[PDB]
Structure formats: C-alpha cells, structure tokens
Amino acid sequence: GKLSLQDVAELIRARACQRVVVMVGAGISTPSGIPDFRSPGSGLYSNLQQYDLPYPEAIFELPFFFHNPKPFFTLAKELYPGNYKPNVTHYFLRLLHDKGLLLRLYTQNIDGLERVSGIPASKLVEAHGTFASATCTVCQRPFPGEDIRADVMADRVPRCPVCTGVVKPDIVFFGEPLPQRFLLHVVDFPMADLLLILGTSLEVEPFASLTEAVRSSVPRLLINRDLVGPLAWHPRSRDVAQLGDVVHGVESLVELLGWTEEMRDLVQRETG
C-alpha cells in the first residue's frame, strides 16, 4: 500500500503542499547534454579512469590539484556558463518557484543550470559550490568568477594578480567545508511539507542523510533511473518512486498537475 505519483501531484495542485524542498544531482543535467558521475559507460568517473589521475575522484582533491590543476580546469572551462541550457527538469523547478511553492532547491551539481534557469539565489543552495566565485589558493583573496573567465577559456591556469598563486573556483573539494548557504538546511528540512529528489545516486553525504531529515510524515518523491539510498534501504510510509528517465518522470508529474501547457510555454519562452 503506497502513495502514487498522482497523489503527490494532487497535494501540489491543491496547495496542500506549499513548502517543497527539492534535492538534485547530476542526473538532472544529462538531458541537457552533460554526463553524470556514476552511470556505467557514460559517467565522468568511468571516463577519468583512462587518464593520468590516480583515481577519478582526484579531480576534486587538493593534493592532486596542486600537483596538476589542468584536469580540473579542463572541466571548469566546459562547465562555465555558456555551453548548456537547462532542460524541462530545471524549468519544472522554476515553475514551482513561480507558483510560490518552492521552499528551497538544494543541488550537488556544479553546472550552474539552476541559476541559469532563473531560480533566485535566495531560493538556491549550491551545496558543492559554484563557478560564480573563486579564491586564491595562497593568499585567500576572493574573486568573482567572471575575473578568471578569460584565462579559463584560453586553456590558461589563472594566477592571482597579487601573489601569482593559482586561483581556484569555489567548487567544494574533498575535505573542504560546505558553503555557508548549506546552513539553511537546519531550518528548511524540518519545515518542508514535501521532499522531491531528482537524478542523484545518494552515494555521497550530506545528501544521502538529508533525505532522512524531513519529518516522518512528509512524502518523499524520487524521480530517478534507480531506487537509491535511504529510499531503497529505509523506506517510509509516504514515499513514492517514479523510476525511469527523469524527463519522462517530470513530464508525467507535470501532466498529473495539469501544468503541461504552462510548462510548454515556459520552456519555449526560455529556450526556443
């Protein structure tokens, strides 16, 4: 005996759920053309196995970075705003926002597509950082991301104007503290009246445990290829899994909401 996708739709449609917290990962940007991390074959971590890194995860490790920052900057150049557009997944979240129902959007992605899709900064927690800002690794001077863009685009490792130190984008590396705005989770998760989890394997903390931080009465909707994380191992009474392609799953929710025409209009106005 389980809730259905329609049940969740109808909670939203009626404004019974008005404080939706959303958690996303790299699966939401595969329909925009960006690989995820862990899909066999196409994921980034399967494909860095072939390069001169001790293991794929070294691309986000500081000792490796100091030894050779080139791989990380190759990734920065590709992900700096400009090459990808948000997809219907992102724009569903923007529609939810514009209807006044989004409490917060927590993202593990570094592609910046939530900001690109028009989610206001106050409504967004970029929990693994952003290319919007950068910090000198030597003197700790902060820079806007726009300052290093020309170097990044030019296949040049950006150096600090004062100390000549490598200027690193504010992407969270292993062992670094999460961003200040992550503090909001303390208030947002107890307040959420609905949790939506999209396109994440829930292999990595803190997002795996954050799925547990909503009240035990709160429905949790997973839209993902696979049943993962606490949703697989620690199910709750009001969980719902919409398994399969994320665009298909979102479009099925949208249809159940009666928002198809509005979604089509939004996507065409933003991306047509």
Ligand X SMILES: Nc1ncnc2c1ncn2[C@@H]1O[C@H](COP(=O)(O)OP(=O)(O)OC[C@H]2O[C@H](O)[C@H](O)[C@@H]2O)[C@@H](O)[C@H]1O
Give the active site residues.
128
Q: Is 130 in the site for ligand X (CB under 6 A)?
A: no
- How many helical (H) and strand (E) elements, i.e. helices and strands, does the chain have? 12, 9
25 is in an annotated binding site: yes
265 binds ligand X (CB under 6 A): no
Confirm whether residue 54 is marked as ligand binding. no
Enter the tokens of residue 22: 């959303």
How many alpha carbons fall within 13 Å on the CB side of residue 102? Answer: 24
> Is 163 marked as binding a ligand?
yes
Instruction: Check residue 180 and report its DSSP letter.
Output: G
Contact letters for Zn ion, residues 137-176 (x by CB under 5 A): -xx-x------------------x-xx-x-----------
Residues contacting 163, CB < 8 A, separation 6+:
136, 138, 139, 141
- Contact residues toward ligand OP2 (CB under 6 A) are 26, 29, 34-35, 44, 48, 51, 71, 74-75, 78-79, 109-111
| Residue that has been written with the tokens 């919007």 in this structure | 132
Out of 30, 108, 109, 242, name the contact with Na ion by CB under 5 A: 109
Tokens standing for residue 137 = 């690794």
22's enclosing H/E stretch is strand 20-24
The residue whose two tokens read 């600090």 is 160
Indicate whether 108 belongs to the interface with ligand X (CB under 6 A).
Answer: yes
C-alpha dihedral, 267 to 14 to 124 to 81, nearest 10°: -10
The annotated binding site for NAD(+) is made up of 25-45, 108-111, 199-201, 224-226
The annotated binding site for Zn(2+) is made up of 136, 139, 160, 163
Chain residues binding ligand X by CB under 6 A are 25-27, 30-31, 36-39, 43, 108, 128, 199-201, 203-204, 224-226, 228, 245-246
Chain residues binding Na ion by CB under 5 A are 29, 109, 111, 113
